[model samples]
Target: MIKLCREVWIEVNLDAVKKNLRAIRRHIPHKSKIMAVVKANGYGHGSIEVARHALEHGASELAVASVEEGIVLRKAGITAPILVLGFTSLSCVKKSAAWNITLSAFQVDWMKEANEILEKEASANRLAIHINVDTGMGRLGVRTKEELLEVVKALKASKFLRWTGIFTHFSTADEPDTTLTKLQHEKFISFLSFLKKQGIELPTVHMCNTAAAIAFPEFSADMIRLGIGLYGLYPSAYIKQLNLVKLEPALSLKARIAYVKTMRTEPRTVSYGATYIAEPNEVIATLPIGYADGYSRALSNRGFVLHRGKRVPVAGRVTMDMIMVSLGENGEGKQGDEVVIYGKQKGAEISVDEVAEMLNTINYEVVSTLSRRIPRFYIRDGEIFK
Candidate 1:
């Protein structure tokens, strides 16, 4: 039976995000602009809310994963420049153009086809475009110089389009090895020179993402796209240790113990599959969070949550909405006690980085995986807001 009503939640420290953006601004050149990546709901910190805080602090523009995401921001009355970092169907061109959202144009055909669609709209708004040059990343972007030239030709011929920027994604900026990053930078520079020879000048030319921007600001062309660091989290341990820019983590996963009981029987097993047996006189606690809440099942029997400064280990396989943890004989926690899944509690801390390590994944996935079912409460300074 659940006693603690709706205690599972994520706390977002808006002040921390403000400081993180300020920290980034302090590190980068004053002439450089920041495109805050609020995609994937600000990496699961709640997109529109984070975007507001980000734009208010130091960000000049916003980036989302899709046209739909841009619509969300636009619907929320966010008037800042938004760049869609992913695919945009020709069907969404009119909406995207009218909404004043920029798109990451990779395929020449996509641009040409979207131009045709735009031609039919007869709207006054110009469709803003950013050419994505595949310098090194094997993802979306033009792979060859011939393809880029074709794109350039198409852009110049188009009547309702504005080529605002050209950009690329780094393949290994966060790694300790700088070889690939250097090569990519060189390749991207060559692309820029090629564009210059064609007599086409873009208003913005960006390449460095958060990791690249922080570790090597020289790689930042005219702007940087800040993603993970905007949420006050690092992309990798190498980047985290670089300490090139100091940031305070802004997110915390917290819940209250749903139930508590003492397993007097030494042979009592916990959760499904009977995976874990209780030690003699062990106190057991259940939390209202499980794999469904984005708590990875990989942490089952291997993860922990902080209870009153004591670490409590998961007692068995995680369930859809609940997980049991061993509190030993000390009764470290009781029903309704606050449990810190990945954040500070008292003097003890269970970092998302540690949870990612235990789950054999990256910190980005850990936070982004957190489902929307868990409500996020935001705070700035001492005031709590939606």
Candidate 2:
């Protein structure tokens, strides 16, 4: 059973997830496969649930950041293909092989270790492995086309590594100017084209990250790794340049009004370092959520939540387990009314973008930082909610 922190529910709209997946596919090449990046708990949307949802909605495979995360999905009964986007240590190589997870082999040393472990185990499953080429991201993978080819050739001889795919990442696909991104994509495709000319087949070649998948269709190859966009948040500020619309945010934070008290003279100051001065004669309602629950304390006195379809300012300092919402004079709100911290209210909507703005951070942090203490309640279709 899911426990609630004073009736606070992080509502996940699976329909929106479906909608975003559809939107992502529409922007990609017709036959290009999609590897839904489900790392970081599906970017804090709950990995197990999102993995199933994504695969059921036409995602060809799932990708996570660690071997354990891949196993988490596998143990949750996700039979779809999973790719671990990070290198696995030798200690965990056995578990990775046993789970039939794909490993990202960027270095020859790691591959050597993996092969050694695979050779040691009888009945150990052969795992699919992808060579991550560091076309531009500079984080992981082979640094050059030569290095990639060398790694590819090495894996070709390995009995245990299924060298099925090759991929890279784009650092600035969401930028307004595509000069740099185009150059990166050209470099990547050039590398792949060179391999093709040499009669080498990588089978699956993908470099388009979420931003490129949505903004630049030309980069979509065998598969595109869908990440931030799958969660219904724009991958970057440059998304406005695209002609795409109809994407819906899949997550919404909701909490119930724990108590409502009115002050005729002065509003009550909330928790924390004496911040948040209430307006005169305003009503203050308490919400059972705070920084400890992923509601950043930085939003104290500056954030707003929906109460009775009206915008209410967060009063004073946000506490470890509570926050005060100031409902001004002439406001009529009840103790059990739904308070939307980030969601739609009547004709107004508070999006993750808004939350990010409030906290002076990116939407990635705004969404992922939501504390796990909050129970996730999922809604599917127009009925059959979970």
Candidate 3:
């Protein structure tokens, strides 16, 4: 494929992804499987490639938020066990079964609908399923043992279904206080023991998320769903301080200096709505990126971009397609020069966590919200490749 015409792009370091996975594998138990979460396009770092590199490093399984995402990996020749960690529609039962994608079973009613679809699903492959026990996260999960038992019974009764795993999601895993997390863990274990009493056992039992895995390595169970950690983004400030594992950021947002001009004339206005005024003889640069590319409008005048290995303030309002940065009266930058939006440049660095702080949000939102319009180029061991 040809290079992107617009210069705004994201650089994903597969080597960083590999290193992150390796680090996480060492942190977790020796026998615990690593289920790499490649959902939301690998937190907007390109899921297909991230998943491939992750599997190559240490991941043995993959998890996505939806069946379509799993299908994307399947189409790309990823034959690892792909588990849909979120809700799946009944209509996708046949397609998931055909693709050998596993889905979480939480709702008995949904199971009834799936049974209807799987009854006629003629694919040789059976629908692989995992039971999601809702211990604390008020999201999609089986709330009670009775409800779980019903779902499990339905799963076993179906000829086109195969029970593979059981898991839970923690809500306060990153919250310093482990009371709630421990409670949730105890509840899930209680459910497991309850099932064991009835001679019901699953091959995979997972509960720890990014934070939980770091805080509770002994609770690794049979697998650990490594999501944000796999991409080298910390789940929380608390987790980052632990330093149990070193994670290298895998994605970097960058853009070329589309154009640069000196404000030779007395005080000139910059960008839309005339929000900023450039002093005479000040150097200004325009980048081919804006709020449309996940650069928030809230960062209009406060945001900074690295130019010539230095920080330059955003001049005016962030527009839909472009944003201008003030290079100061004597700062150095030229047309077509490289700029770092939130990444490393020479000896300077701008981390995604810092960007998220500026937006008053989390790092996950800062990275994952990046639009698909910005093309991503892959990098490995300092070498750029297709």
Candidate 4:
């Protein structure tokens, strides 16, 4: 019943998911906790599906961008601890607490609102909070070291505040510039020192996002917040500096050639526009994918799909419903032939990295941008199960 491309389907392998998680875990310290970042619908692999797989495979915690995402996981019977990694409005604080979701507090006003909501609900626990300090990422948290100390002290004074952790974002952890990263780390350590001097010990002190976890293990203090790497992607160019072997891609996209035709003479034009002229008798196949289905128009006439162990080039513009590929001699392909758009088939491969290179973008965009309308058929345990 999974209708995609009238017949074609994109299958996601969950075993690959487990393998990717294990690979990421091998890099983390034994003492450090793993909070798998399953936000953005698990980077568009299907959030609930990825979250379930992550929990089953030893992920200790789940990090989401909002309270609603946490609630969705909770509602889906995922009892693992959920951390709301972004700031939520005061009006939503009560609902967040009601769901037992962890909240991030970097501002006095947010803490005050959380306290008021807890009091109104007569909640046993005021609110478990992780204090974010603006070390170098000027986006969130208290801007200065002094401001962080003041906020921590104020939170400690309240019986409801459990000051669960101290955290910061690495503005350039993925870059080769270790100088700025070192400074950011120093700032984070100094903030922790300030808390220790005040006799306020935080439970988990984390600053390692996926990039830092892979590139800089020194930053993996108490917990590693893994996102892209957990999904089998190198977080940044800085990670390559480590000179580690490449990781396997956890997701692959594929479709079938729905139609094929051979021309004895070149048509003046092919497809919608006259842009493509049949210079000679050409072999062409139409693929059941388009821009509306997350296939970029920029890939028109540029992207390649594998068929019968040969790579074929896309021809003409990629329309909303289909794209044409010039088979050249390979145009002998028939309808229903498996077309490898970005995966392995028939001893040939079209990797996401290659697709990204063709589109002049990142692999994340190439895969994650796939529209939900295209059903994700998950494969696990060496079989197409979902």
Candidate 5:
């Protein structure tokens, strides 16, 4: 491995990802498949690399958020079955079929229009679709049984479209009280029962996300979509407390101390708006990471990083390309000393969940918000690779 030129970078542990996948597989039924969701660049862990590791491990398929994401995987030589879990335009049906990508079909009109587009182009490959049934999640699915049946009928009548799968999302599976999740699951089952009454047997049916996969493995139908857990982060603190699986965080946010100086004067401020005031004789270190690098400005004056095996508080408002940390009187960090932004340092850890809690957001946003400007270093078999 070569030394990284950038002072700030993200390190992804691929072995941790593989371990999480195996842990998930141990809980799932052997007949059930796992679809590792790699959308939003694998939740900002580098999609291509994560997807490669997933498919090589226990994942049976890869799922993305859009046709563009699926296309990216295909271009990168990902040969696994790729499913687009979001709405795709009818105009892109031909391209999707050409790339052998599966799409989510929630609207009957979209399916009708896609069939027309496929027939108009005389595409040799059929447009594979997964019917999205909206059980409780008020987004991107057929809301009622009537709408679901209509979409099923359209797919059945289509000559160029293939109904490959059906799935629903659980909005509150991570909640401690699973009453709502159970109701959603019941509604989904009712829909499937209705389809069975009509003598329609769907090829594959799935609805378990990370939370549901961990909390309710019984709902694992034909497949489970491993999203956040695939990256070694729990869906929520509740899920973490459950200890259903032992997952190691695969990502580490790190930076080097670009500059080190002493704050000799009293009442000196740091960064914009003078959000943080330094006390007399306080040691300050400037890190080459800020909002532009996806370190949220909301963490200004509120976040802490690990330095010299000690917790150091951020001194001021996070700037566009830099952040200031208040190293204490005995702060041992120096120029070029490694700083752990959200990772382990001498047994201390700043987890992604902790960062999300500080920002009043979810773990998904914390990792997905990480910008692509920061290069990602992959670690496999306890060795870093560039």
Candidate 6:
């Protein structure tokens, strides 16, 4: 049985996650493999659990942002091919190879340096590497074809390195305009052609992230990396216009009312700075969640929570451990009553996208920023698991 010592928690819907993966798979080519991006603790929805569900449903492999994140998944008993999409230190290359984790090669000398480290350490483990070509993102990848060739040459010369895959990221795939995406795709294709002419056989070549996968299926080569979409979150608002797949949000934030009281003061105010002035005879309730718990303070005075099937406005500034909500005349709220921060409540709903809009951010930030201090409760088959 699952137990929660804290009143505030995140609820994950595994069934919804599975459904989203199926929808993504159906939209993409049948031959394309799915590499579920489970980095940042699965966007703060518990990486281990989310990875297990993704693999069980349709994900062929897993991708993480860092070596530590990959190590966490491995320690959790995930045996699938895990790729660390971020930089790996030369000294830590042996650790990654020992665990069979694939590392991304960006700089031309990365593989050569790693090979030297492996040889000096006398480590028998072979490091599997993926070449990250910077078509347009200008992030951690080779900037030009010449640099990519240099990296390829280094990979070939390295005795302890194996070139398993090559990929590029689309900087504007989620935008409604496909001009930049097309240009990036063109560059990637040209690079691939150059590699082909050079007799470099890339075992696995992928270029589509969630946005690219849905907007441009032709770019889906050997694999498609599903990140936000795996958690049932859309990559961007523009992608929603394509309507390629029906994605259901799998995560929700909830809390229990810790205290309820009636305000009778003339200049009624709530929280620090007296930001919110309560109306006379207004009913108020306090919850055990705040910015420290990933509930952004920007939501203070701008956010709304659901209580007893009605919208309750946040009273004042969100504190470190609590937030006050004004329960209107008919609020019908009491201590311990359930509160919906961003989820469904008696037909009413608060979406993470809505919260992001209110905070002038994105859904990815809204969900991924959720602090782990609050425990997570998994929901499978409409039943909550601990």
- List model 5 lDDT by residue over 1-386, tens digit each: 44666688989999889889889899988879998888888889888888888888988898888889888888889888888877777678777888899988777788788888878778889878888888788987888888888878888899998878888899999988988998998888998898899898768889998989898898898888889888888878898899878998888988888888777765587878887777667788888988988888888778889887788888878889998888777566668888888889998988888787877888888888899889889989988876
Better of 1 and 4 by TM-score: 1
- Deviation in angstroms for 32 in model 5? 0.5
User: Where in model 2 is the C-alpha error above 4 Å?
Assistant: 1-5, 264-269, 276-280
lDDT of 6 by residue, 55-174 (tens): 999987999888889888889898999998887777787788789999888776667678888898888788888888887888778888787888788788888888889888888788
Residue 86 alpha-carbon offset, candidate 3, angstroms: 1.8
Candidate 3: stretches off by over 4 Å: 1-4, 121-123
State the C-alpha lDDT per candidate: 0.83, 0.78, 0.83, 0.77, 0.85, 0.84
lDDT of 1: 0.83
Top model number, lDDT? 5
Candidate 3 Cα RMSD after full superposition onto the native fold (Å): 1.9
Clash count for each candidate, listed in order shown: 0, 1, 0, 0, 0, 1
What would the per-residue lDDT of candidate 1 be over residues 259-337, giving only the tens digit for each residue?
Answer: 8888876568887899888876888888888788877777888887888788878888988988888888757556678
- Name the 10 consecutive residues with the lowest summed lDDT in model 6: 1-10
How high is each candidate's TM-score? 0.94, 0.92, 0.95, 0.92, 0.94, 0.95
Indicate whether candidate 1 or candidate 3 has the larger TM-score.
3
**Residue-pair clashes, model 2:** 1
Instruction: Score candidate 3 by TM-score against the native.
Output: 0.95
Q: Write the per-residue lDDT of candidate 2 for residues 173-206, one digit (tens) a residue.
A: 7888778887777788788888889998667878
Q: Which regions of candidate 4 are displaced past 4 Å?
A: 1-5, 158-161, 264-268
Q: Distance from true position, residue 220, model 2, in Å?
A: 1.1
Name the candidate, 2 or 5, with the larger lDDT value.
5
